[PDB]
């Protein structure tokens, strides 16, 4: 709870914090905001939160329901033979096409940092990023 406050003060202009820095603060804090959270907090307070509203946002970004079973849903969908593996190109195409799509270098960099071989255990990939 202390780190929350220092991170806020690094990025706060005029006592308010922008949503982009509040999302950077939240990742620095080990949380995983998505554009869904960022849209919910825009509807309420706009693009600049007070420390009180910034706290509410960090609260929204908790996502307790986050586990391997949940994250693998899109990868398993394309694993037709249930091998538990997908290629790097398969996962790059998934990550850069739908949702809060990553860029192509972002997806590549994330798969290369997990393994050096082409076929990825997507259950272990999702576990590894969950920390």
């Amino acid at each position: 709870e202390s780190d929350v406050r220092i991170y806020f003060n690094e990025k706060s202009s005029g006592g308010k914090i922008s949503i982009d820095n509040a999302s950077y603060n939240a990742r620095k804090l080990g949380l995983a905001p998505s554009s869904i959270d960022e849209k919910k907090i825009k509807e309420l307070y706009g693009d600049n939160l007070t420390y009180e509203q910034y706290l509410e946002y960090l609260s929204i970004c908790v996502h307790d329901k986050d586990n391997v079973e949940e994250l693998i849903k899109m990868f398993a969908h394309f694993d037709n033979n249930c091998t538990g593996y997908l290629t790097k190109s398969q996962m790059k195409n998934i990550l850069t096409t739908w949702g809060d799509a990553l860029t192509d270098q972002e997806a590549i960099d994330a798969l290369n940092a997990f393994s050096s071989e082409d076929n990825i255990d997507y259950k272990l990939f999702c576990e590894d990023i969950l920390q």
Partner: protein, 130 residues
């Protein structure tokens, strides 16, 4: 302008299960979902191991931007079929469509309960749902 590459790309990986290569049978479905029809001889001249880039180039050349579903109904000519007849033809030609998919089609293209389906309306609805 009307660039189609992002849609061509997403459709490829939809039929290929996100692999950069697509099997020939899956490639025929992919191209058909954009109204593209090849003859038997054109089919023979295709590469055996079709990858994303080949499709992106083939789609640009073969897709009809003015009349995407010209092979359902051609505006440049001077059309209606009874529902149970239309369903019969789908089943005769051995369609992959389940009973539910057929129902979404029928209420999409025909909102009313008319005893009879406008093929021009089908090409209209499907151009919108690209």
């Amino acid at each position: 302008a009307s660039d189609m590459e992002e849609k061509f790309r997403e459709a490829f990986i939809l039929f290929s299960s996100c692999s950069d290569h697509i099997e020939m049978y899956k490639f025929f479905e992919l191209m058909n979902s954009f109204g593209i029809i090849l003859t038997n001889d054109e089919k023979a001249a295709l590469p055996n191991d079709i990858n994303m880039d080949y499709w992106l180039n083939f789609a640009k050349k073969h897709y009809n931007y003015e009349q995407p579903f010209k092979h359902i109904n051609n505006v440049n000519e001077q059309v209606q079929i009874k529902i149970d007849n239309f369903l019969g033809i789908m089943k005769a030609l051995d369609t992959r469509l389940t009973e539910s998919d057929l129902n979404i089609l029928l209420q999409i293209t025909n909102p009313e309960n008319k005893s009879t389906l406008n093929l021009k309306t089908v090409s209209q609805k499907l151009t919108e749902s690209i």
